[PDB]
Write a protein that binds this DNA or RNA. Structure first.
Ligand SMILES: Nc1ncnc2c1ncn2[C@@H]1O[C@H](COP(=O)(O)OP(=O)(O)O)[C@@H](O)[C@H]1O
Ligand code: BEF
Ligand code: BEF
Ligand SMILES: [Mg+2]
Ligand SMILES: [Mg+2]
Lengths: 415, 409
RNA sequence: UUUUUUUU
């Protein structure tokens, strides 16, 4: 008997289930769940709820739900300050426990006992090392994207491993003009993560992008999808993004390998510039002087932790939009991240995919994510591709890789 | 028994030692019972004089910011030895009496690692007579490693001397930080005498811990997770500590990364004057970082202050162009790194033609400068990439720039 | 008014 489980089930099964208990005529869907929960409480049976914690300024908090993009919701579960102090809870902590309907003079479900804090024992949460105190590091463990199934979509993953490898805790960018292939390449990334790295906690944050891409992503990726389309204001974009990044930080505190696929971070950087207080100083392109400190900390949250776990963020960026702002935002994030995979519009207009700008792509300290021979073969491959043009490079590399199933067999053939 | 020593020792020691006798409470109790025994207590830190007259010995673990374990310094002690912000002080300390919240300083044993009575009367930093760098700080190791190529090309392109005021100018991902890391290793390799300080301002956290583990010196960091107000304060303490050591005839070298983002931090804190330069830079924002960078200088009296700081260009923001060109009119050494060279994966990605050091004849022998001048004319007609691929390969044949000059003739 | 836009 769980609240969010009742919210997921269709209304048809809820109305039928409510009639089995013997209730009055079945009112809006939200009322069906509420009336069913109350009747179950009358029997003496226990009730359960869950959600990500958000501590308000007064000291208490609520358990936001994913169906509201972790925003204020009618089914939020109140968390008393005493409960927060007892287990050292902070914003982002996923909480599950027994709940009770609101009494007379109350408007929210209350939390009686917390069973699980971040998918673990509540006691283990009391003693922990905070995210701000974790010792940072360069990416060590390689997150190989290559399927190896000889698929035609696998070409994008294979070229990615050769141009700019991705490790745990990476802070990368999929930089390209509109319609170059950023979103689908991000989708291609989500598929390889779900297949090759099911151990990682995969999240897909969609900020100020197309709505049909939201449903396409949530029915394609094997993970959680938090979205805030361009139908939403910048105020919502920021708040939604803040909740996701804090939930990631909390899981990293539990030695988890979290991956955040952001699209787009340039749209998110614009959102911050919309809500930022005017400083009297504006950068070239119309970007406030203090507007990029917030998005830089969001993107900068991604990091490799020595104590355990990691936070990876692969976000898409826009360039050559005619607006200098996007060049400033991109260059600022490049001075923050450690990996950039460029996509060329010139290649995309020839319908050559993946339309990857090989020379401009790359990863920092890639020797820590590749074997000694792998790096030496990638190093030689770049020297050969560099003199080529943008299009000739991809047409050459894709035709060579298509001859074999894996890059390892391609390297053996390369000899 | 020193307080700093007791803060570095693990908690297990405080337990075992405590039986023989929070971490802030235990250390406080152990030291408190050391005074009743009559035995002396010691502590250390960097002094910061507040506006009222008294001061506090800040700790390096708190990045020289306000700390719970800071040591109060009486105003009388400041007058008796002419102490100023930045002085490193060690001495006997006493646990706070009732009504006090901090340990107190009884008497100073060492002021900047010297005797207090001798630091009382010395020529101030603002009174030292400046000069152009006339003492060469050779970067080349001569071990034959691939990492030495950066140092060798650096010696040929832009020699660094004691008191230099240089810049590692380049766009993002060109190789500024690792260029800076290579410089730190050569200073610890060839110049153990110089006091090496590494100031990391508004940069990546992973580069902080990485720096700390490969550099033989002090690492003061303030990552981009920190406010601009913290950047300034931390940078103010480091530059003042450097000035104090220079007053003691010591060769201090500060490797900053990045100074461009430090200038941004000053621009965020600076009061609005109503006049804003092109790019969003307040007309008074650059004064503070300009006197920070301009603090570096060669001193005739003895010792010097060297500052090699990285700078950003081609960021799409006219602000960084104003900042870079302003520091260029302040410094006297510039090492540019090219993005198109780094994108071809040619390291070091040094723009040979646009790099150089002022008054380089004071840092090189007459024969050495001749060969550098000849090598200059040969490389100039070449393109950026071809220049590096040419110089790197010719240096690869040799282990030392001296044997490379022998092949020249 | 400055910065942003003009503007490269
Ligand atoms: N001398 C070098 N040798 C090999 N790789 C280098 C060198 N200099 C820079 N790189 C590459 O560039 C990447 C980032 O360069 P970095 O020093 O961060 O430039 P910046 O500080 O200007 O951002 C590193 O991960 C490294 O792989
Ligand atoms: F139009 Be694309 F998604 F940048
Ligand atoms: F991104 Be670099 F460190 F400027
Ligand atoms: Mg898209
Ligand atoms: Mg750098």
């Amino acid at each position: 008997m769980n609240l969010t489980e009742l919210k997921n089930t269709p209304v048809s099964e809820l109305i039928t289930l409510g009639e089995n208990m013997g209730l009055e005529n079945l009112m809006r869907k939200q009322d069906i769940i509420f009336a069913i929960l109350k009747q179950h409480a009358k029997s003496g049976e226990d009730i359960f709820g869950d959600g990500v914690l958000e501590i308000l300024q007064d000291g208490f908090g609520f358990l936001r739900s994913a169906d509201s993009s972790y925003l204020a919701g009618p089914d939020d579960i109140y968390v008393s300050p005493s409960q927060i102090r007892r287990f050292n809870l902070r914003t982002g902590d996923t909480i599950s426990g027994k709940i009770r309907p609101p009494k007379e003079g109350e408007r929210y479900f209350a939390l009686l006992k917390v069973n699980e804090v971040n998918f673990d024992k509540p006691e283990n949460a009391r003693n922990k090392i905070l995210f701000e105190n974790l010792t940072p590091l360069h990416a060590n463990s390689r997150l190989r994207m290559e399927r190896g199934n000889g698929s035609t979509e696998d070409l994008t993953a294979r070229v990615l491993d050769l141009a700019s490898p991705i490790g745990r805790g990476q802070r990368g960018l999929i930089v390209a003009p509109p319609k170059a292939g950023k979103t689908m390449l991000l989708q291609n990334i989500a598929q390889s993560i779900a297949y090759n790295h099911p151990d990682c906690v995969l999240m897909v944050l969609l900020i100020d992008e197309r709505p049909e891409e939201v449903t396409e992503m949530q029915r394609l990726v094997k993970g959680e999808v938090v979205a805030s389309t361009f139908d939403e204001p910048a105020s919502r974009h920021v708040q939604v993004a803040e909740m996701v990044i804090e939930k990631a930080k909390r899981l990293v505190e539990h030695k988890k390998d979290v991956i955040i696929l952001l699209d787009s971070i340039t749209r998110l950087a614009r959102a911050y510039n919309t809500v930022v207080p005017a400083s009297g100083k504006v950068l070239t392109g119309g970007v406030d002087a203090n507007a990029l400190h917030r998005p830089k900390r969001f993107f900068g949250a991604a990091r490799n932790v020595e104590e355990g776990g990691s936070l990876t963020i692969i976000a898409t960026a826009l360039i050559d939009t005619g607006s200098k702002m996007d060049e400033v935002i991109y260059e600022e994030f490049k001075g923050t991240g450690n990996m950039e995979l460029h996509l060329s519009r010139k290649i995309a207009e020839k319908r050559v995919f993946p339309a990857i700008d090989y020379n401009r792509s790359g990863t920092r300290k890639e020797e820590l994510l590749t074997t000694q021979e792998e790096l030496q073969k990638m190093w030689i491959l770049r020297k050969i591709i560099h003199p080529m043009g943008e299009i000739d490079a991809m047409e050459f590399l894709i035709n060579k890789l298509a001859m074999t199933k894996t890059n390892d067999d391609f390297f053996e053939m390369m000899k």
